[PDB]
Design a protein around this ligand. Sequence first.
Ligand SMILES: CC(C)CCC[C@@H](C)CCC[C@@H](C)CCC[C@@H](C)CCOC[C@@H](CO)OCC[C@H](C)CCC[C@H](C)CCC[C@H](C)CCCC(C)C
Ligand SMILES: CC(C)CCC[C@@H](C)CCC[C@@H](C)CCC[C@@H](C)CCOC[C@@H](CO)OCC[C@H](C)CCC[C@H](C)CCC[C@H](C)CCCC(C)C
Ligand SMILES: CC(C)CCC[C@@H](C)CCC[C@@H](C)CCC[C@@H](C)CCOC[C@@H](CO)OCC[C@H](C)CCC[C@H](C)CCC[C@H](C)CCCC(C)C
Ligand SMILES: *C/C=C(C)/C=C/C=C(C)/C=C/C1=C(C)CCCC1(C)C
Ligand SMILES: *C/C=C(C)/C=C/C=C(C)/C=C/C1=C(C)CCCC1(C)C
Ligand SMILES: *C/C=C(C)/C=C/C=C(C)/C=C/C1=C(C)CCCC1(C)C
Ligand SMILES: CCCCCCCCCCCCCCC
Ligand SMILES: CCCCCCCCCCCCCCC
Ligand SMILES: CCCCCCCCCCCCCCC
Ligand SMILES: CCCCCCCCCCCCCC
Ligand SMILES: CCCCCCCCCCCCCC
Ligand SMILES: CCCCCCCCCCCCCC
Ligand SMILES: CCCCCCCCCCCCC
Ligand SMILES: CCCCCCCCCCCCC
Ligand SMILES: CCCCCCCCCCCCC
Ligand SMILES: CCCCCCCCCCC
Ligand SMILES: CCCCCCCCCCC
Ligand SMILES: CCCCCCCCCCC
Ligand SMILES: CCCCCCCCCCC
Ligand SMILES: CCCCCCCCCC
Ligand SMILES: CCCCCCCCCC
Ligand SMILES: CCCCCCCCCC
Ligand SMILES: CCCCCCCCC
Ligand SMILES: CCCCCCCCC
Ligand SMILES: CCCCCCCCC
Ligand SMILES: CCCCCCCC
Ligand SMILES: CCCCCCCC
Ligand SMILES: CCCCCCCC
Ligand SMILES: CCCCCCCC
Ligand SMILES: CCCCCCCC
Ligand SMILES: CCCCCCCC
Ligand SMILES: CCCCCCCC
Ligand SMILES: CCCCCCCC
Ligand SMILES: CCCCCCCC
Lengths: 231, 231, 231
Amino acid sequence: ITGRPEWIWLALGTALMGLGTLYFLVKGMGVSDPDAKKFYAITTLVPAIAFTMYLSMLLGYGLTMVPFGGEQNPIYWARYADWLFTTPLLLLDLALLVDADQGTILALVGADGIMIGTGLVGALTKVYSYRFVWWAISTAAMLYILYVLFFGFTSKAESMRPEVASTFKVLRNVTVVLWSAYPVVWLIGSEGAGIVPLNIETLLFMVLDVSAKVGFGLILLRSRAIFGEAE
Amino acid sequence: ITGRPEWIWLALGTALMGLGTLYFLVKGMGVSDPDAKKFYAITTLVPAIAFTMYLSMLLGYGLTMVPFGGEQNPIYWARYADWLFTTPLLLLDLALLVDADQGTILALVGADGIMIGTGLVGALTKVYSYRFVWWAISTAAMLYILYVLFFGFTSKAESMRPEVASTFKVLRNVTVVLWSAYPVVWLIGSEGAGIVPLNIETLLFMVLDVSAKVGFGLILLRSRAIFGEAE
Amino acid sequence: ITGRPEWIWLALGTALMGLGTLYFLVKGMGVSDPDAKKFYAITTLVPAIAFTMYLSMLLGYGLTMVPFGGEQNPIYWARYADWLFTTPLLLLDLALLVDADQGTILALVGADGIMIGTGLVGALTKVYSYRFVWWAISTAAMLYILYVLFFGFTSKAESMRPEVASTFKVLRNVTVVLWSAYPVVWLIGSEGAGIVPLNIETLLFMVLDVSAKVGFGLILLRSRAIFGEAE
Ligand SMILES: CC(C)CCC[C@@H](C)CCC[C@@H](C)CCC[C@@H](C)CCOC[C@@H](CO)OCC[C@H](C)CCC[C@H](C)CCC[C@H](C)CCCC(C)C
Ligand SMILES: CC(C)CCC[C@@H](C)CCC[C@@H](C)CCC[C@@H](C)CCOC[C@@H](CO)OCC[C@H](C)CCC[C@H](C)CCC[C@H](C)CCCC(C)C
Ligand SMILES: CC(C)CCC[C@@H](C)CCC[C@@H](C)CCC[C@@H](C)CCOC[C@@H](CO)OCC[C@H](C)CCC[C@H](C)CCC[C@H](C)CCCC(C)C
Ligand SMILES: *C/C=C(C)/C=C/C=C(C)/C=C/C1=C(C)CCCC1(C)C
Ligand SMILES: *C/C=C(C)/C=C/C=C(C)/C=C/C1=C(C)CCCC1(C)C
Ligand SMILES: *C/C=C(C)/C=C/C=C(C)/C=C/C1=C(C)CCCC1(C)C
Ligand SMILES: CCCCCCCCCCCCCCC
Ligand SMILES: CCCCCCCCCCCCCCC
Ligand SMILES: CCCCCCCCCCCCCCC
Ligand SMILES: CCCCCCCCCCCCCC
Ligand SMILES: CCCCCCCCCCCCCC
Ligand SMILES: CCCCCCCCCCCCCC
Ligand SMILES: CCCCCCCCCCCCC
Ligand SMILES: CCCCCCCCCCCCC
Ligand SMILES: CCCCCCCCCCCCC
Ligand SMILES: CCCCCCCCCCC
Ligand SMILES: CCCCCCCCCCC
Ligand SMILES: CCCCCCCCCCC
Ligand SMILES: CCCCCCCCCCC
Ligand SMILES: CCCCCCCCCC
Ligand SMILES: CCCCCCCCCC
Ligand SMILES: CCCCCCCCCC
Ligand SMILES: CCCCCCCCC
Ligand SMILES: CCCCCCCCC
Ligand SMILES: CCCCCCCCC
Ligand SMILES: CCCCCCCC
Ligand SMILES: CCCCCCCC
Ligand SMILES: CCCCCCCC
Ligand SMILES: CCCCCCCC
Ligand SMILES: CCCCCCCC
Ligand SMILES: CCCCCCCC
Ligand SMILES: CCCCCCCC
Ligand SMILES: CCCCCCCC
Ligand SMILES: CCCCCCCC
């Protein structure tokens, strides 16, 4: 395990996701409100899935070698397995907060699936120049998602409770900033142009992942917006 | 890319799915009705997914070699990845049109999953005679789906709005004819008996795919059946 | 096929799932009640999926070799493909019976996904001692599911119809006993410590699978709890 310099960040990531999972699990024990239960379920599952995939990367299972540029390049494929399930759960948290219509939710989840799926294909593609074609398609799917979060959701939040409108606005802003960093790190890291070494890349993704999951969850689950308006 | 004679049909397929995706995306921009949004979301996602998988076939990612009959046989596995997601979306379009009950929808999607999954296993099976066992099981799942579309849905459409009944009937008929061709092409093509060469097989699937997705979508999204009855 | 001593149990399993599938399919033909249709759909799909995966194991497709302990160890990976889809369907049968809230259903299905997914990783892991780390995480996800079935569902059933409360209690008890055997068989069988040989392991899983699917389904589909209260 320690044979890879990036192991320290995989281990820290595993620990922080594990701790985040346990914290949300305990916190949600005292919850009976049916609406709050939905948000706790979604939000606890996110770091639990990430915990398993960080562990698989730490132990070496979630790593494969991909030939491109005349080299055997270490590619952590387990990231995409994580993201396939956790990024639509994160979007679902946002969509339920603002009572999004079903068509909009399906558009978001579908675009998200395309985003992660094409990122996976790009990560595993052996023809170097083609990796960036997949990156571009994935990034276009991301831009669609960000567009919807701003010009379909923000003006939906404003007709809702003030506490859900303010909580949505904060989580929207956190999401757009954090999620936009992922394609940049991929592009300059070992999957793309290879300018930033894998150990630093792994650190960067770990900070983004913990912030986008445990950070996000801490903000959401401390808000009164997750509860039905009750006396 | 041009090293494979079937590349021209993969390229045309990619282009037509891409163009179809953009057309539906633009067309649905001016839509606020919650019901119509569902149909636009579902129907736009279908060629978008197909676009990505056609591209993966064009670039060579979605192709593998399978030993059977003492030969290395080129198998485009990306078709099944496409179909796994797009065929239940197509069925969902039909089921929502007639306000199908939840049990019926689950039966359809489940049978569809079995249909595509067993087709994939058959496509990748190395014992030649066993490929046709999987083809038979998949075809039985197809026949179940077609049965339900006729003797569970058609008489559901007739108690609904005339515009939804007439639109459903047309899309049902398009679906049954087009979908029934797929097992025949598989059986006589490079996956099955090998009587029709891969380049012609690829052409045939491209015509079926564009018709079943973009053709289907053009009929559906031009109907007033996708809108709630409103003043 | 007969080259593997466990083939007889794979063949019997295939037959019993096939027969169970046909029986439930015929039985549900005379059903119009929308609630009952849901239970028939879910419950018929379960042995149908299991039939396909038992067949893939019989024909040899669903088997791979995994190096650990200095040996090539036969691992039937198709079990996890089965279980990935059938165990959440089984939980859905239980959850719908007691009209579980959406948050609880998502927690169950999510924990179940983690349970099966980590079992799959453990089954395919090449470092022997690490296989048991994945077994432990999977078992913890199982224990969560069993906890919810007892201390979240049982007291939900009691405020419902007596026929649904009594049917739920029986199916809950069947589920907890049968499902708890699976991690034990894995641990002592060819995936784990290797004390029980593969042919006996295969027998054990076949008895558990038929009981947990066809047995379970026979109890559920003969109950009046699956019908809406109607005059
Ligand atoms: C509604 C939304 C969910 C829409 C989803 C959007 C989605 C369509 C976007 C594209 C997804 C698609 C790229 C998934 C591809 C998975 C694939 C990378 C798995 C690895 O297999 C690739 C090659 C080795 O590189 O296998 C070597 C050759 C092997 C023989 C491969 C044969 C097995 C195939 C992988 C079977 C395909 C199954 C499905 C792709 C399962 C989807 C997995 C998940 C990653 C989407
Ligand atoms: C409700 C509905 C959805 C019901 C669904 C119906 C469904 C049950 C029908 C059968 C689906 C099942 C056949 C999927 C099999 C996928 C498999 C072909 C992927 C390729 O792996 C096959 C061999 C190489 O040929 O791998 C070589 C050996 C490797 C070590 C394989 C180990 C990895 C396994 C593939 C893990 C299994 C994961 C699940 C099958 C994911 C499902 C993928 C999708 C195609 C259904
Ligand atoms: C809401 C709930 C559903 C939550 C779900 C919980 C879930 C997160 C729990 C963990 C699931 C995760 C372990 C699935 C891993 C599948 C993996 C074993 C498939 C086989 O690939 C493993 C190695 C060979 O051993 O591939 C060799 C290297 C290859 C290059 C691998 C590259 C292809 C990757 C497999 C692509 C990943 C796609 C997704 C994992 C699809 C999920 C399949 C299913 C088994 C969950
Ligand atoms: C918890 C993990 C999260 C929130 C991950 C988010 C990841 C993305 C938004 C990834 C986006 C990518 C692209 C837009 C193109 C390049 C490849 C990706 C997959 C890194
Ligand atoms: C957009 C793509 C569509 C509508 C594809 C439909 C495909 C089928 C109905 C495929 C059916 C098959 C069988 C019935 C058995 C042989 C294998 C298949 C998968 C080709
Ligand atoms: C129809 C099949 C059923 C009901 C299978 C149930 C399987 C399980 C509950 C498996 C549990 C496992 C663990 C808890 C850890 C070890 C690995 C598994 C996957 C066997
Ligand atoms: C969105 C953030 C992307 C920028 C990442 C900056 C990383 C700077 C680290 C120094 C680069 C290491 C190069 C020498 C090894
Ligand atoms: C459902 C349509 C299946 C029939 C396809 C007919 C294809 C005819 C093309 C000629 C066959 C090529 C054989 C000589 C290369
Ligand atoms: C939950 C049941 C697990 C116990 C399984 C008992 C199997 C006993 C069979 C005898 C073991 C075979 C060892 C000699 C080959
Ligand atoms: C490819 C995996 C996509 C599914 C991820 C799980 C999250 C799905 C959330 C469903 C949202 C509800 C839509 C109506
Ligand atoms: C194996 C992939 C199956 C899922 C495909 C996505 C479409 C699912 C549509 C869900 C229909 C709603 C059922 C209640
Ligand atoms: C990884 C596969 C998980 C999906 C299995 C299919 C069963 C899903 C049942 C959905 C229950 C409804 C939740 C709201
Ligand atoms: C186009 C929608 C406006 C809100 C999205 C902001 C786009 C940020 C760009 C992210 C950088 C990705 C490379
Ligand atoms: C049995 C249901 C009647 C409607 C379905 C028509 C079946 C068409 C056969 C398709 C050919 C597949 C090989
Ligand atoms: C902790 C919840 C109480 C009900 C679950 C009973 C646990 C049975 C243990 C199963 C054995 C697995 C190794
Ligand atoms: C070796 C790099 C070749 C450049 C490929 C860039 C493709 C980016 C596509 C953006 C439309
Ligand atoms: C080499 C071909 C052997 C014939 C197999 C046909 C099987 C079809 C099954 C239909 C019930
Ligand atoms: C070779 C076996 C080494 C023992 C591993 C047991 C790990 C079990 C983890 C339970 C917390
Ligand atoms: C990680 C295993 C958890 C089993 C005990 C249940 C914890 C309490 C959860 C309350 C919903
Ligand atoms: C509760 C702490 C969980 C941390 C387990 C994984 C950390 C890796 C240590 C090497
Ligand atoms: C908008 C046109 C999209 C076409 C891109 C793929 C066509 C392949 C050209 C070689
Ligand atoms: C209807 C009987 C189904 C049995 C088919 C599979 C049994 C395997 C026989 C070798
Ligand atoms: C993006 C950083 C999130 C910070 C989380 C802090 C949570 C405290 C309530
Ligand atoms: C099956 C062929 C479909 C033809 C689509 C034409 C759409 C015009 C409205
Ligand atoms: C766990 C054993 C189940 C027994 C099923 C018998 C069904 C008869 C109604
Ligand atoms: C990591 C366990 C958290 C302890 C409880 C925190 C207050 C709910
Ligand atoms: C008003 C919300 C500001 C949140 C910005 C957080 C940036 C990481
Ligand atoms: C809305 C601001 C987006 C900031 C992008 C930051 C990418 C590192
Ligand atoms: C391909 C872009 C379509 C242009 C608009 C067509 C009329 C909505
Ligand atoms: C009355 C509907 C006829 C549609 C037939 C289309 C055949 C491709
Ligand atoms: C309902 C008519 C079906 C026609 C099947 C055509 C197969 C090529
Ligand atoms: C296996 C076929 C079952 C025959 C009908 C049983 C009574 C519904
Ligand atoms: C009162 C229900 C008892 C069911 C026990 C079944 C054990 C297999
Ligand atoms: C509730 C009793 C569980 C029995 C476990 C049996 C495991 C073989």
